[PDB]
């Protein structure tokens, strides 16, 4: 269901938004989960270009620069 599927999201900052924060932060903090951003909710929080629309060009240029050398 939507509300259940929306529960699982790789970015923890995103989950920390709409889910219950304490639980999100802890359960992440133990695993040393590394948020790579890449999503919308999260990029807005930290306040940079949305990896869509106008930014979609950008993220593209960075995402490939990442995992690169």
């Amino acid at each position: 269901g939507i509300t259940k599927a929306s529960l699982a999201t790789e970015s923890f900052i995103s989950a920390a938004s709409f889910q219950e924060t304490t639980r999100v932060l802890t359960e992440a903090a133990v695993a040393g989960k590394r948020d790579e951003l890449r999503g919308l909710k999260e990029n807005v929080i930290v306040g940079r270009l949305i990896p869509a629309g106008t930014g979609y060009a950008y993220h593209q240029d960075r995402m490939r620069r990442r995992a690169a050398g």
Partner: protein
Amino acid sequence: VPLDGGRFATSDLNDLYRRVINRNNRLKRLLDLAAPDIIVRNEKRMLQEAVDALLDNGRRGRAITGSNKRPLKSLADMIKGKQGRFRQNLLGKRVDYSGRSVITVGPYLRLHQCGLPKKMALELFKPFIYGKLELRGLATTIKAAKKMVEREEAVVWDILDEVIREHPVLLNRAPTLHRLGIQAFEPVLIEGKAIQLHPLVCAAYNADFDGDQMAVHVPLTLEAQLEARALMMSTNNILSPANGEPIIVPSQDVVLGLYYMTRDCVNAKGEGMVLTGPKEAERLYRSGLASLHARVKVRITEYEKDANGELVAKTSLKDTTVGRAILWMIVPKGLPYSIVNQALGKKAISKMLNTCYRILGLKPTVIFADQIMYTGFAYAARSGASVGIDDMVIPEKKHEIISEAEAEVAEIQEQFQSGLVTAGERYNKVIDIWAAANDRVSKAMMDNLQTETVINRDGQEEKQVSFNSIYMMADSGARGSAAQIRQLAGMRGLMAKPDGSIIETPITANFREGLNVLQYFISTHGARKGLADTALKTANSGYLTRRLVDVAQDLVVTEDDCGTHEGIMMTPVIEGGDVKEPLRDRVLGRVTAEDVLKPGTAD
């Protein structure tokens, strides 16, 4: 930080933090005094409690702030914020360069602009103005520039017209739902404190004019100007993203105009004559010679581009009215006269716009659209449609229908008095006849109201669809509906007692007559439940869109063609009868999974 009157105000963490320290420090002391265990233990427990209250308060006891009952807020409560889940990106953030106020009409506007108060625009662009003022050297330095505009020297207004010209502003209304809740416009300086808003757009915003306020935002960075112009500009979104149908379709006055424009009565000034072309049709009309609606043959030239990128021309004699002839001046190019030769209701008038778009492209649809509005208001203005109390016509037969249905209920009552029918069976019974009666009165008054204009051309009589005001409104699609009309003239409904049963003595009066005490009182329950119901269905909708964007959000068109042949088989919905929704609408704009055959194949 201090306050006025010398009072101080502080965050609650201090109260918390202070405690962890005290308790902590006491413990350090209690070790060098080698206190008994029962004590250092207790101190240790207290130290734990204090840290807990500091970190996340409420998982044990909820310590309360000093002298103030309200529990002091801990760091965990700092992160959560409140209003459900909102981290200050989610609830909202205040923003500079913005403003807001009440909005009004402005029919003169082109669809791409909006009325903005002079002062709002002064204060909004203040930094931009400063920069242009000293770019031309009208102000020695930045300070003086401030002093000038603060002084409102006559020269700045002209400067504001420069910085405004190409510089869109974002306009936004309160419940932003689809992306059309924010659209970009080009500013036009307006005396007055109200925002003027292009009528055609009023539909997309769901903005009535009853005092709705809109907020304005200035896009600052260049990229915001170019984003605004190529994305959020009004003209670039003319079609609803929900379904391809145009969302700019003229609303109510304009559709009453065009309907009143193209409509025809049976006998009218100028009936039967012939004209070379629309130019002289308007020339006939404006002069008082010919009626707006009279059946007339006129020569028109339509065009069809059905060649290869190429417009065919054809001229012929069309049998039409004066109004359709006049209107033809607006339809650009490609389109056939066939599109205007009808009565031009709201539905057709939209597909007019639609075809115009899907054929000629964007620019013509815009400019077409502007023209349609200007002309719509205008001729509607000429028409003088109004509504008086005698425009709502009650059937002559109403009292008689009620009386018969009143015999039926008294018959079934006698059948219940004699036990021929059960109580439950009775309730359904009386309701059935009353329900049926109302339909009868409705389709009675509808027959009289719709066509009863009964008129004569050179002969005795003939009868056409009424020119009565209120019918024109409902027929056109402007406003009103057979349902609401039925409550005006025919009896209104059978109300329902709060528990949900529906009363078996309907409301026999209507609004043209008076409702008496009892009847009004009964109407109240339905009324009150509506407002209550709507305000809640409002909340549910909002809740649903929330979950919805949450489950999707990050999904974006990324690759070009994944190149899978895979796909679903589309058929029209065909429910039990014929075609509750066609195939042509289901497949439009989608892409075929595989080549499709004629009935023969290798075709």
